[model samples]
Target: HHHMTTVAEVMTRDLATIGPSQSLREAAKMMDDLNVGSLPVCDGVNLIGMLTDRDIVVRAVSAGVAPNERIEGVVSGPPDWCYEDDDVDTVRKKMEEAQIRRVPVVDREKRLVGILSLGDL
Candidate 1:
């Protein structure tokens, strides 16, 4: 038996974000303070990309880049997303197909509405 659930139902509405111009150290501190692994990079209300702890370790630290470098230089591109109205199965399928642990939920206008993590499932 399966029950239809939307992304809005499982997503966390509270968000923690970073600006593209902010330093990697700043992003790291924000992630540490918020106890989050990822930060959505925004330009005003627009979601531009995502920055994750793994990205920092792999792209920056592993590359021998300074820890204090700007995240805009190291952050990853925007990830695959799902609409708030999408069903749980649909979201799960997309996540599995994309090999992503989390997916950003957006409205029709592509505004960041919330985030859905694997833990929610």
Candidate 2:
């Protein structure tokens, strides 16, 4: 077996985060500008939840919720996260068990740090 490694060693340290109170329109704009399908919702460095383009289209747009509407109601939770100090092997197992392709990474204080994805492994 390979030597054990930490999640912080492989996680994507650079991040583009959003907020719960931000408008879906704003979220959509950011997603489009960043060319990403989803964004992590952070409330002052704290991971609150996540918002996806699909959530905007399926949950908000299809429902005729105004574009200016806050995403606070549309975000998905409770967030599945891993600590930066966690083992990559265990983190992999957790992601596999949850069937998650990507997960938010946080510090011991629960502050958002980075993101870990299947591809990162």
Candidate 3:
């Protein structure tokens, strides 16, 4: 197991984001284009929510919602975030507790700084 590593050391800092008013298709394309499973939904620099591929399939397509539906309608609420300096073990525990595969990493002002994936551990 990895030891004594900070989130900043392993997290992916390059992020792709979407506006709340953007279409689901645009969000999906962003994810595919960036090769990421989730996109940070932002209102300016504020991390408002998360939109994942699974969310698209379930909340939009599965529910028969229009593909052009606003991402805000189907996106998950602001996720449980981690600090860049947080320990990997703590993040791992939080992921387990939340039953989630990824967590956004934020700075002191709550601006998204990175994204931590379970695979990074």
lDDT of each: 0.83, 0.86, 0.85
TM-score of 1: 0.87
Clashes of each: 0, 0, 0
User: What lDDT tens digits, residue by residue, belong to model 1 across residues 12-35?
Assistant: 998777888888889889989987
**Candidate with more favorable, higher TM-score: 1 or 2:** 1
Q: Please, what is the TM-score per model? A: 0.87, 0.84, 0.86
- Total backbone collisions, model 1: 0
Q: How many backbone clashes does candidate 2 have?
A: 0
Q: List the residue pairs that clash in candidate 3.
A: none
Q: Worst lDDT window (10 residues) for model 1?
A: 74-83
Best by TM-score: 1
Point out where model 1 deviates above 4 Å. Answer: 1-3
Query: If both were scored by lDDT, which would come out higher, candidate 1 or candidate 2?
Result: 2
Which 10-residue window in model 2 sums to the lowest lDDT? Answer: 94-103
Ranking by lDDT: 2, 3, 1
